[PDB]
Amino acid sequence: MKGNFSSFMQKEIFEQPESVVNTMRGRVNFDDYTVNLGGLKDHIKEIQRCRRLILIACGTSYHAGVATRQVLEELTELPVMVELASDFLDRNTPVFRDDVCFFLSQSGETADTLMGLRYCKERGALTVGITNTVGSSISRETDCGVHINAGPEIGVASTKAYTSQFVSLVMFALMMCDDRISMQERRKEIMLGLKRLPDLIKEVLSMDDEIQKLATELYHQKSVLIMGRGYHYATCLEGALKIKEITYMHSEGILAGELKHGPLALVDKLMPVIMIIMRDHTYAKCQNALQQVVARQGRPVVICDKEDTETIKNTKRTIKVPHSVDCLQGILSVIPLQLLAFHLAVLRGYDVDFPRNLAKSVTVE
Amino acid sequence: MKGNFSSFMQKEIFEQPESVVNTMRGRVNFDDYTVNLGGLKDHIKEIQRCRRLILIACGTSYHAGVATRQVLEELTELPVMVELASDFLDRNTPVFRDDVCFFLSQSGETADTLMGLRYCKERGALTVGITNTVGSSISRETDCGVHINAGPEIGVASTKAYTSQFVSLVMFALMMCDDRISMQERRKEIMLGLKRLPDLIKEVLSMDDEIQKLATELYHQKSVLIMGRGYHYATCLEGALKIKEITYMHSEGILAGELKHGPLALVDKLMPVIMIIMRDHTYAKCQNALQQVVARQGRPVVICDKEDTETIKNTKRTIKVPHSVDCLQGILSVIPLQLLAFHLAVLRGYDVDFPRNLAKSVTVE
Numbered sequence: 001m002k003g004n005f006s007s008f009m010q011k012e013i014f015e016q017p018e019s020v021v022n023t024m025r026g027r028v029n030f031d032d033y034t035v036n037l038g039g040l041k042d043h044i045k046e047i048q049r050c051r052r053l054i055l056i057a058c059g060t061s062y063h064a065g066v067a068t069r070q071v072l073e074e075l076t077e078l079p080v081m082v083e084l085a086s087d088f089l090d091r092n093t094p095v096f097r098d099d100v101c102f103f104l105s106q107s108g109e110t111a112d113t114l115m116g117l118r119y120c121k122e123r124g125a126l127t128v129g130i131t132n133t134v135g136s137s138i139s140r141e142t143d144c145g146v147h148i149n150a151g152p153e154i155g156v157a158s159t160k161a162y163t164s165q166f167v168s169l170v171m172f173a174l175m176m177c178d179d180r181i182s183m184q185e186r187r188k189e190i191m192l193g194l195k196r197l198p199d200l201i202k203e204v205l206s207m208d209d210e211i212q213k214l215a216t217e218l219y220h221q222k223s224v225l226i227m228g229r230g231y232h233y234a235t236c237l238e239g240a241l242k243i244k245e246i247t248y249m250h251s252e253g254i255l256a257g258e259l260k261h262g263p264l265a266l267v268d269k270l271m272p273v274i275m276i277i278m279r280d281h282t283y284a285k286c287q288n289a290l291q292q293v294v295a296r297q298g299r300p301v302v303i304c305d306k307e308d309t310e311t312i313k314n315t316k317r318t319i320k321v322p323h324s325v326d327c328l329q330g331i332l333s334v335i336p337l338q339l340l341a342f343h344l345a346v347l348r349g350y351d352v353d354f355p356r357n358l359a360k361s362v363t364v365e
Numbered sequence: 366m367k368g369n370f371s372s373f374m375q376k377e378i379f380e381q382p383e384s385v386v387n388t389m390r391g392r393v394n395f396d397d398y399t400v401n402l403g404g405l406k407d408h409i410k411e412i413q414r415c416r417r418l419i420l421i422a423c424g425t426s427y428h429a430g431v432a433t434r435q436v437l438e439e440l441t442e443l444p445v446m447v448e449l450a451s452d453f454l455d456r457n458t459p460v461f462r463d464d465v466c467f468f469l470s471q472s473g474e475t476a477d478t479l480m481g482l483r484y485c486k487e488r489g490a491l492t493v494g495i496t497n498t499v500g501s502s503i504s505r506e507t508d509c510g511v512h513i514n515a516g517p518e519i520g521v522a523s524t525k526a527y528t529s530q531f532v533s534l535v536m537f538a539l540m541m542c543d544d545r546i547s548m549q550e551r552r553k554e555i556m557l558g559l560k561r562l563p564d565l566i567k568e569v570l571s572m573d574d575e576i577q578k579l580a581t582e583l584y585h586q587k588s589v590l591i592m593g594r595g596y597h598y599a600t601c602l603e604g605a606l607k608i609k610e611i612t613y614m615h616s617e618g619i620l621a622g623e624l625k626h627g628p629l630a631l632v633d634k635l636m637p638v639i640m641i642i643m644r645d646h647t648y649a650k651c652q653n654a655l656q657q658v659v660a661r662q663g664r665p666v667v668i669c670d671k672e673d674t675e676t677i678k679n680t681k682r683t684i685k686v687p688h689s690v691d692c693l694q695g696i697l698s699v700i701p702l703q704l705l706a707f708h709l710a711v712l713r714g715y716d717v718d719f720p721r722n723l724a725k726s727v728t729v730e
């Protein structure tokens with residue numbers, strides 16, 4: 001039972017202050033800035049010997065990799081490859097004995113991610129499971145793993161499991177660099193953001209009524225282009241998938257740096273556009289993308305941060321989310337897009353929890 | 366002057382039997398199965414010492430990397446990473462002294478690809494230029510390079526330059542494995558396909574009138590989903606971009622293995638779909654994607670090969686292209702999509718050569 005909510009998905013979205021706390025429970029100690037993933041305690045030293053991280057997954061679990069890639073590169077200093085499992089297998093991707101391969105899966109039974117796992121094992125790679133289902137195939141067949149501990153997720157369109165996968169990979173990253181003197185201030189910045197994150201998610205959830213009103217403006221449209229870069233590239237892909245999944249509107253994520261390489265031809269006053277701009281090191285380049293969409297008569301809705309005075313000042317339609325650290329900001333930025341997919345589906349008369357043509361786990365072929 | 370054609374783009378498309386011959390001229394000897402890229406003659410041995418290939422580009426030049434990745438993995442046995450240049454830079458991607466980095470660019474002046482190049486040089490990586498413009502910045506600042514020799518390309522939506530980039534990267538691959546006894550039959554298979562390719566492209570071009578008729582069926586639509594996998598993933602992305610660029614229809618490339626992970630919710634009898642199915646090792650899995658689109662009331666147009674009796678037999682709308690080798694087939698499969706973008710733009714009244722909001726080369730920011 002979902003008692004208090006009319007759907008599992010809305011309950012799962014509004015559960016994210018608690019699911020994030022649950023993911024970090026018994027793991028992150030805020031008194032002494034320590035993180036310990038017991039499921040990885042044995043194997044961590046072996047992992048630090050490896051020469052490359054490969055993150056292998058499908059759909060939203062794939063996006064959680066795209067969302068943490070840069071901070072994994074930053075803090076591990078290893079090359080990080082993120083791969084859609086179906087294509088990884090079609091190409092007979094080269095994998096080596098000193099590769100560590102991560103398998104990201106809410107269900108733990110996704111057929112292509114699991115066959116990806118067995119392919120890598122057969123080549124002698126170290127395998128790590130990041131899942132939300134204890135006792136699943138992927139959880140059982142990996143060498144080590146982390147249970148994200150988000151609790152059961154019933155809505156086919158994933159919400160809390162994405163944000164808990166994201167926190168889980170950030171925690172792995174923090175363990176990886178815990179012996180580096182030069183990285184200790186960075187780690188402490190990150191851990192203080194994680195401490196603050198539950199309260200900041202409660203604050204994003206208070207904008208539900210405002211997002212319902214924007215859904216009211218959009219539910220007759222047939223397309224929407226969601227543009228972001230850097231840390232927010234994953235957020236645009238993930239919001240795009242969520243809207244496709246339960247609303248059946250043609251939403252597409254566009255890498256903002258690619259705009260002038262073709263997609264900008266789609267922009268005029270009739271194409272709905274959502275732009276994400278955060279105050280990280282991509283800010284000036286995102287301000288360029290925005291200016292270029294407006295120059296071509298686009299009328300974008302802009303997801304920015306609450307303290308971004310210059311874009312709030314100069315832009316009429318803003319969804320203003322709280323400010324966090326650059327590599328956690330996408331946990332906050334994705335939530336209005338989760339809520340927008342939900343409200344659009346309600347307005348169109350569609351089943352938010354069990355959309356047409358889809359299942360929670362794709363276990364066959 | 367384009368004399369004989371009403372546009373540069375259609376002339377460039379119909380030039381592809383000759384541009385392919387021009388790309389291979391003085392390079393591939395069919396009498397003794399030798400390939401020699403003189404621009405790489407000095408540096409080839411150093412390249413074979415390197416531990417990873419990174420392919421860095423924007424838009425269609427990016428797609429040429431996606432299109433040759435698998436055969437580069439196959440024949441070099443190296444890891445191959447393909448990167449959108451804007452994102453490569455946003456993430457401060459780790460690059461090493463024993464990386465070989467390829468910069469793919471028709472113009473040779475694309476700002477993000479060029480800044481990508483300088484970033485890699487500064488870290489001591491070996492840099493290789495694949496371009497269509499002699500004397501360009503990228504051509505001049507790399508350590509070595511190949512001029513694809515396609516001739517001037519005026520149409521903003523790239524055609525011959527894509528297929529010549531593709532052949533150029535296949536030729537590099539063949540040079541890389543020319544000392545391996547076990548790979549000699551494979552190389553000879555590939556070189557015999559390249560020998561046959563110009564005549565097979567003439568045969569695809571003879572279906573112009575048939576593609577004009579399909580454009581006639583589609584030019585009132587607002588969306589189209591183009592689905593493929595494996596070797597044809599690049600083809601679906603590239604056709605999708607070409608239709609966006611000059612027709613302004615919302616065309617999106619979908620990885621066919623990802624269908625059941627969300628995008629299948631978009632499929633019903635009103636969503637136009639183009640599916641690509643080739644007789645390579647992904648055939649049975651592509652037949653599964655097709656069956657799943659039809660099960661959900663989709664009415665796909667299917668690009669298949671002429672000798673694919675089972676899908677011709679069981680499917681009403683086929684664009685039947687000649688059969689080639691698996692890793693060259695996308696040179697043939699992309700051409701109907703080039704011609705479809707062209708005819709759609711004509712029917713809608715748009716400038717095929719100089720679309721709105723775009724330029725041939727993005728040299729600034």
Ligand SMILES: N[C@@H](CO)[C@@H](O)[C@H](O)[C@H](O)COP(=O)(O)O
Nearest residue numbers: 059060061105106107110157158
């Ligand atoms: N249900 C979709 C997400 O909202 C889908 O893309 C999903 O992520 C995919 O099927 C993989 O499932 P997994 O996370 O259980 O492996």
Ligand SMILES: N[C@@H](CO)[C@@H](O)[C@H](O)[C@H](O)COP(=O)(O)O
Nearest residue numbers: 424425426470471472475522523
């Ligand atoms: N004109 C477009 C291709 O049709 C665009 O995506 C293009 O590939 C991109 O701007 C990169 O240009 P380049 O190949 O000159 O580097």
